[PDB]
Structure formats: structure tokens, C-alpha cells
């Protein structure tokens with residue numbers, strides 16, 4: 001364990017998780033366990049966060065900044081948004097390539113932590129499937 005002046009990273013993650021209500025649906029011991037499982041990591045512009053084809057084994061949540069999807073008809077993502085749950089939702093490969101348009105701070109969640117947190121809250125699992133369906137399709141498939 002490096003850098004331990006006064007759990008500054010853990011404190012920042014607390015406030016970071018506070019920016020996400022999805023994590024608020026988790027109990028106290030769950031949210032605390034999810035916080036100790038999740039880590040805040042910033043991706044520099046041009047840094048690929050997700051690559052189509054690659055298997056998703058972690059989640060991503062934008063805290064500050066915007067992101068751009070790698071495709072012919074991508075979209076602009078902002079803070080308070082989550083992505084890369086479709087894989088952790090089912091296991092399918094990156095539905096599309098994700099690339100941070102600029103330096104944005106996001107949090108990382110373990111696949112095991114995702115299934116454990118989803119097990120804690122059945123609503124969070126439904127919210128994920130809703131986004132997975134929307135992200136996966138919900139327009140074409142239909």
C-alpha cells in the first residue's frame with residue numbers, strides 16, 4: 001500500500017461514489033466493500049477505455065469530463081454516466097469501442113464486485129439490463 005497520508009484516495013473515491021446514485025443503492029457494508037473494490041482511475045485523451053471485441057471484465061463511470069465513442073455514429077458522454085456494463089451484465093464483448101475524448105476521471109469496478117453489488121440490489125441489476133438493452137440495441141434488434 002503506497003501513499004497513505006490520510007486515506008486521501010479513499011476519501012476521494014467516497015465523494016466520487018457519491019456522484020453515482022447507482023452505488024447508493026448498495027448497503028453500508030456493500031458500498032464500503034464496493035468502494036474498497038473500486039478504484040478511481042483517470043484516462044488521458046486518446047486513451048482507449050473499451051475496445052469492440054474485447055471481453056468486458058470491468059465497469060467504467062465518468063466522474064468529470066466527456067467521452068467519445070469510437071464509431072461512425074458515436075455519441076458524447078458526460079459526467080454521471082456509466083458504460084461497459086453490457087459485458088459485465090451478460091459477458092458479451094465490447095458492443096463498441098470507447099475512447100476518452102479528453103482527460104476524464106472515472107472509477108473502475110471489478111466484475112466480481114459488479115455481480116456481488118448487483119446481487120445486493122435487484123434494482124441495480126434491472127437498471128443495468130435496461131442500459132445494456134438500450135446500449136446493445138432497443139432500436140435495431142426490436
Ligand SMILES: Nc1ncnc2c1ncn2[C@@H]1O[C@@H]2COP(=O)(O)O[C@H]2[C@H]1O
Pocket residue numbers: 050056069074075082083084085086087088092093094095096097098135136
Ligand atoms: N450508443 C451508445 N451510447 C453510450 N454508450 C454506448 C453506446 N453504445 C455502446 N456503448 C457502451 O460501449 C460499451 C462497450 O462495452 P460494453 O458492451 O460492456 O458496454 C457498452 C456500452 O456501455
